[PDB]
Structure 1
Amino acid sequence: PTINQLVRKGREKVRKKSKVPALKGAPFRRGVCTVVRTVTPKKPNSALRKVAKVRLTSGYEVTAYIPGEGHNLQEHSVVLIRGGRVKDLLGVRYHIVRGVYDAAGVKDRKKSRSKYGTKKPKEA
């Protein structure tokens, strides 16, 4: 575009949409489970994927993933939601944080335990 044109018009700064309305971008948000359901992923993958519908302190109802080998969640469980999506499930935008509130850490987890929220064993 001519210099004159840039002078008349100018470039448009490019705004960035948010991947996570955890509302006021907060690193985390507390909420309570509505449903704890399993759901089936998309084409080149098969599994029963563990998921929880949460009402949130934001006033938002969202869908969360429940990472780890097994979970204690159900019903009215209070929970912390951390954001980040499961790729191969449609519309799951956030993860549940193991080891906080009503979601316990993964039983018998030796490798990276700070994810999955489990504490250090004593060597026997």
Structure 2
Amino acid sequence: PTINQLVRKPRQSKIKKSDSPALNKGFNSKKKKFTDLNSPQKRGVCTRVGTMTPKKPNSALRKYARVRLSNNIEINAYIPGIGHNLQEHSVVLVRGGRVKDLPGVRYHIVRGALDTSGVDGRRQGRSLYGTKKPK
């Protein structure tokens, strides 16, 4: 554009959309609103735990968990690891991060935070998947 129609209509930027849009909304219960405070984690109670199959050339069945968080919104959340302890009504700490080759789930679960316990036998990549030092 020329210099006059760029003074008269300035350079508006291109907005950046944040992934994990459920972790950056709070819920004031005394006013029933949605605040914005950019939380790194947010805990929640679980609703359904089943298995979901990938849609890629991959072929498996992945363990997800439908969790409603501190704010009253529903997500789907993946469980990393081997074994879990996630029947229903358990309190788990939702970690951000998308898992691809799975539709409609883009969050993890911190393995070992509130009520989920760590994996049964890892000793290699041990800090994530959350188990303590053996012996």
Gapped runs of 5+ residues in structure 1?
none
Between the two proteins, what is the percent identity of the paired residues? Answer: 68
CA RMSD of aligned residues (A): 1.0
Q: State which of 65, 73, 97 in structure 2 corresponds to 1:84.
A: 97
CA distance in 1, matches of 2:61, 2:106: 18
Letter in 2 for 1:2: T
The C-alpha deviation readout for 1:30-65, integer Å capped at 9, x for no partner, is 101100110001131111100000011111110000
Within-5 A mapping of 1:60-71 = 60-71=73-84
Gapped runs of 5+ residues in structure 2?
26-36
Letter in 1 for 2:54: P
Query: Which position in structure 2 is the counterpart of 1:95?
Result: 108
Tell me whether 37-46 or 21-30 shows the greater mean CA deviation. Answer: 21-30
Q: State which of 39, 44, 53 in structure 2 corresponds to 1:40.
A: 53
TM-score by length of 2: 0.86
Letter in 2 for 1:16: K
Query: Which position in structure 2 is the counterpart of 1:109?
Result: 122
CA distance in 1, matches of 2:108, 2:91: 14
TM-score by length of 1: 0.94
CA distance in 2, matches of 1:12, 1:91: 32
